[PDB]
């Protein structure tokens, strides 16, 4: 189950120049200064922290792109898609100490701009609303406060769960890019 942690990226960051190696930098500052704090809060700083960065759309269909992104990837494009920013949210949420039980991934379709649109889920309990943690909002809101986001599927390191139409648990790995994506980071 693939990893990020403040040494490996201290280690990535002396492999870069520039703006570039301060963002290394400054993603593992994060971390460090996330352990430890209220689930709030690391909720929040994640999604801010985060939420600062060059935002990548398909040109001709003005929605995600196909490729998915590795948090590295991420950080040395200096951004990336909707989906991109939810993957590198739920591993920096990882890392600081958030249960990877409480976060899903979910692909939701947005019913205000007609086509798909990722997010990251963070449940209090399994039967909680989740809130969520968005690229095109500030606010981390509750699920039932996002009507214009209908969820399809989500997923995290461990499982993939379609959303109800408790569940069964799918193999991750059955989603080819997450598949490959986790086994880049390696």
Known sequence: ??????????????????????????????????KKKPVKIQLEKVNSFFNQFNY???????????????????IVDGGGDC??????KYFTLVAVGVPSDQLRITYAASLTLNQAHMVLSFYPTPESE?????????????ASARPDLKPVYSFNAE????????????????????DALMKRME
Do not use: C, H
């Not at 189950?1 to 500052?29: C, H, M």
């Not at 990548?56 to 991420?74: H, L, N, R």
């Not at 989740?130 to 509750?142: G, N, T, V």
């Not at 069964?168 to 890019?177: H, Q, V």
């Open 159 to 178: 499982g993939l769960w379609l959303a109800k139409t408790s569940s069964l648990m799918g193999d991750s790995k059955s989603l080819g890019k997450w």
């Open 130 to 142: 989740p809130l969520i943690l968005d690229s095109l909002e500030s606010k981390i809101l509750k």
């Open 83 to 88: 989906e991109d920013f939810a993957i590198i």
């Open 56 to 74: 990548e759309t398909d040109p001709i269909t003005g929605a995600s792109d196909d490729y998915w992104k590795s948090p590295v990837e991420f």
């Open 1 to 34: 189950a693939p990893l990020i942690s403040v040494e490996k990226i201290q280690k990535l960051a002396q492999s870069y120049q520039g703006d570039t190696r301060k963002r290394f930098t400054a993603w593992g500052n994060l971390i460090d200064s996330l």
